[model samples]
Target: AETNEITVGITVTTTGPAAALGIPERNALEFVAKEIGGHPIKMIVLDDGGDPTAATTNARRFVTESKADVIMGSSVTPPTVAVSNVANEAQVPHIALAPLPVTPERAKWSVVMPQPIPIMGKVLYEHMKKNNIKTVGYIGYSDSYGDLWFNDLKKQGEAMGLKIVAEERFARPDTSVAGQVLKLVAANPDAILVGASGTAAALPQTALRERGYNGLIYQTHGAASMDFIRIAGKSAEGVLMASGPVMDPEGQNDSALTKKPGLELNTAYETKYGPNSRSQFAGHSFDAFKVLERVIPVALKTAKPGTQEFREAIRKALLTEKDIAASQGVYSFTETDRYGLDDRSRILLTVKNGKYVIVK
Candidate 1:
């Protein structure tokens, strides 16, 4: 009798600074199945406004008050960590919307949808090396997400013989990165990498160009949406962005595993939001539903919903699932590795004629 329904609690920054990431994720939830494996799925969504404290409080409510079977949340890194802490303490399965580091504690409960730093970083670093960029200036969020990128660049960039020239940081809601940009322009590296996400990631791009820093600009996978292009406008023209294969359905071979679904997601999303409105954030959420479709049935075979055993079963299903193809790539998660994506998941893209295109 306790198996009537499975409850999923989602907290994302739907109305705040990270809304470019959260809003698309929220909209994609509309496409998820209300019932999975013969059990009704009850979903509860809350907006944490990109605040870690707010996300933690909401996560506490999800586990205690709502008795959620799974938790998914907090669009960017900082709040994702806060929600991850709650899920681990509550011993509930967490499907993170943003990328977070996998620890032993988190490995037991949390699995992230977005590609990991290493996979994305590999493509970015390779592009820089190929373009003959020697020195790189870094500007990123003053949060965990920023830390992930900076550390990756140092570890991978340094090993690849790419010099690190300058490092600066900013907050997600900050309007001006003028001081940060001024420092970067003076440092005058061969290229600059901006580590913020959504529309916020555009700040550095616009400022750098306006300040006459004419070198190449690179953005992380976090800024994969056209919204960044829309906000940056003319300045975004030549920026290189590390993105998932889902960003360019038309560019992929028809036989590619992810291409068809990627196109379907693009059509469905663009139909509602209008031309060129397809978003990578939406792709992450859409793949979450695809994952649930694959895992929930396996989970149902082992345990009943609303029980701790059921939640653990779901978590186990995610960890054990192999070669699960979705809009992003073929995911193969393990106990120690939560990301489970390969180079197939990455694409080096650039803005050309105001659109995301696979770099030549």
Candidate 2:
């Protein structure tokens, strides 16, 4: 039952403050489009501007109007969550490009490309424990993404006997984090965890370095893009982050599962976008396509695209994927766990000489 074509709907924040992250995701998918399973693909891309309402509207349109065989993303977490709800209601298979909470019910119809939130927290805790970090400061956006990281980090830090000495919040579009950084510096903890994402995440790190806070600065994978470094400039140097294998293949613990696709996609992206263009954001998007490449052919064995049977087949086939290599890491999905990534999915990265070099 091979289909003549597959239609995929992509809703991303292509025209928003987070364009630095979403634009690369869009570009990476375009690259993937060229080498799909020989079937014609119609990609319907919509810009949500990082707005939940816009994302929901796009999702509904993709499901009801475009009849997309699969729905890909909306870049950041909130928008992805919004679209996931719509995809669930429509019984369509959705693959998220960002790390968001996917309840078991949602996991039945959706998959996330990024590493799980708790896994990220565990990685940071392990790094902190090894570094003897007894106390840390925290600053993040006043949004869901910030809350998820802050709460998860606090939970993991507490278990590791690490104290969060100070906590602060800033808006995504804030011009400066001077107030937040000043408060964090006053607490004078051993380290600081910035829970924001995109270029905006750079504000606190820059302010901390300028204000002479020399403690270790940690950032979440949300800031895993070159725009963050370019925005923060020298202030970003020596900053530590838990990131996918795309930018720091050497730091990947020699896991062939992740390193294989990590190296391949890195080469393909840099070849098209120039050196240093490879980013975790782009890698996650590429990994989403890798999942489709594996599952679509299998799904086609039973049902045609654009049908409910095909969508369900995609979901089942995706959950059954095992030991598959992708740009970020090895993916193995289960009925209860749709993200399918582990600690091996991440590596400790530090910015050096304007690049991400692996440390752990």
Candidate 3:
């Protein structure tokens, strides 16, 4: 007989540069850990401190020691990718809360919940074209996450006839991006896009505003959390970005069917946390639980937990899932696309009076 308990190992970058991003993700998952698919779930959470090596160590412990049936997390891309390696080697199902590289090797056992990077690129490009932005200044972290956004923005912006006038990079732990910001201010493009996340994202924007650049500022979904606003203060006002439905749920115009699940999640999370505590990062973690709820029952039917059969069953079930509406977007997994979300999964938002308001 199958055991009535299942273990879920969750690792998040809860202690380092991205703590603002990971802490909320951890909170959302903890909010949903009562039970899943009629089985009591044991959620073990670890903080990787935004370190890939630390994340890898946690992943191995989850697999070899805790015997987790599923692995979730490492709040940023690099650590998420590291955790994914362990999941693939152990042949366990991994549901990542961060954006993933989504290579053929990684897709076989892992899936990500964030809106695909290219989709965000399209949204930003559309905004630029609408505003007649002929040139742009770019600044971001000197890491994989930054590279992903930089490459995507360049590809999409260039296609739209928008030129990148300046490019700058900074480490997340850097105390100052003043040198880089001066260069960007000198370029004086129509707008500037900062591709960094969490409190780190604020550094460039702060420097830019202090340097007296009045051009528009844009950020990625990375800055969707309230921490960005709290960190950026007055500088973040009027900043535009693309984000998941959870950021401003009232802005989504989908049918009652598509809107129901996200609305429910928003209400529940906000009721407990606070009004508008809804963040894309937290919503992604909530969606991860929703995925498990849909797949766990099926996985339990034919195989027991703590065995290879059960792990494989979980992976197979996830690949076959379709049209699952969660707080972020409707997910429809496939062999080719593990992220499984379209443009509707995201909407453009601008920060106004220290809050996110949908950009019509």
Deviation of model 1 at 42, angstroms: 1.4
TM-score of each: 0.97, 0.95, 0.96
- Models sorted by TM-score, best on top: 1, 3, 2
Clashes of 3: 0
Kindly state the number of residue pairs that clash in model 2: 0
Clashes of each: 0, 0, 0
CA lDDT of each prediction against the hidden true structure: 0.89, 0.84, 0.86
lDDT of 1 by residue, 44-134 (tens): 9999999999999999999889888888977999999999998998899988999997788788888889999878888888899999999
Judged by TM-score relative to the true structure, which candidate is superior, 2 or 3? 3
Clashing pairs in 2: none
Worst 10 residues of 1 by lDDT: 1-10
Model 2 stretches astray by more than 4 angstroms: 1-3, 33-38, 250-255
Q: How do the residues 15-94 of candidate 2 rate in per-residue lDDT, one tens digit apiece?
A: 86788888998888756754356678888888998898999999999977888999988788889889989998889999
Better of 1 and 2 by TM-score: 1
Best by lDDT: 1
Cα misplacement distance, residue 302 of candidate 3 (Å): 2.1
